[PDB]
């Protein structure tokens, strides 16, 4: 119907990848308080039947695996897939604990033909990070 199907024996699998302490070499500032978030979200999606799994300070070449690992999974009986991200970043980019990574080759593993079980099922990617470096002065 107009509304999505949300009543399989499992509601979902909410993967929150909290990143905060960046390898010094990357010269990446720290994220004071992601934990509050990660902790809040962790509770917010736990309260709606989601197998939340909080992983922290992973590297770009750690995040991808995770993904390639998640997409290669039976989701046959699950109603959705929420994937909170927390880190720093530039447009399209997304930071691991060593260096940048591309948002797109992340989402790919779920793309219609890739992640089958998750076909006709909402893939929600909430992303909390910088999308460049402009400043919004506002008005009124």
């Amino acid at each position: 119907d107009n509304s999505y199907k949300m009543d399989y024996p499992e509601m979902g699998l909410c993967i929150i990848i909290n990143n905060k302490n960046f390898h010094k070499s990357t010269g990446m500032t720290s994220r004071s308080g992601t934990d509050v978030d990660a902790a809040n979200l962790r509770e917010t999606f736990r309260n709606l039947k989601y197998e939340v799994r909080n992983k922290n300070d992973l590297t770009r070449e750690e995040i991808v695996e995770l993904m390639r690992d998640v997409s290669k999974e039976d989701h046959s009986k699950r109603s959705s897939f929420v994937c909170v991200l927390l880190s720093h970043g530039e447009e399209g980019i997304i930071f691991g604990t060593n260096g940048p990574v591309d948002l797109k080759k992340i989402t790919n593993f779920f793309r219609g033909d890739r992640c089958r079980s998750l076909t006709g099922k909402p893939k929600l990617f909430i992303i909390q990070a910088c999308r460049g470096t402009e400043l919004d002065c506002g008005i009124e």
């Binding site: 308080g33 033909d113 909402p122 929600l124 992303i127 909390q128 999308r131 402009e134 400043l135």
Partner: protein, 91 residues
């Protein structure tokens, strides 16, 4: 036979090209206002409809504060991107 990029949804904390604000104490603007809405509304509204007050509740009741001429007095606006093909109601 359906599009592979559909059924996706990207709710960014900020709009394209901008900085995202996070509190050294409470937590990301966008991230708190989020849970905060999914708290009261995840059983009354839809989702997009839910995503809009998140934006509302961040464009309205939030504002940057600093000693740096440069970072002081700034705003934020999240970004809801949807390739979904149906509405979503959590229940």
């Amino acid at each position: 036979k359906i599009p592979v990029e559909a059924d996706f949804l990207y709710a960014y904390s900020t709009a394209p090209g901008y900085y995202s604000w996070r509190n050294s104490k409470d937590g990301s603007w966008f991230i708190q206002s989020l849970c905060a809405m999914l708290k009261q509304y995840a059983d009354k509204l839809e989702f997009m409809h839910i995503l809009t007050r998140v934006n509302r509740k961040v464009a309205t009741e939030f504002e940057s504060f600093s000693f740096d001429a440069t970072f002081h007095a700034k705003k934020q606006i999240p970004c809801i991107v949807s390739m979904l093909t149906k509405e979503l109601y959590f229940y």
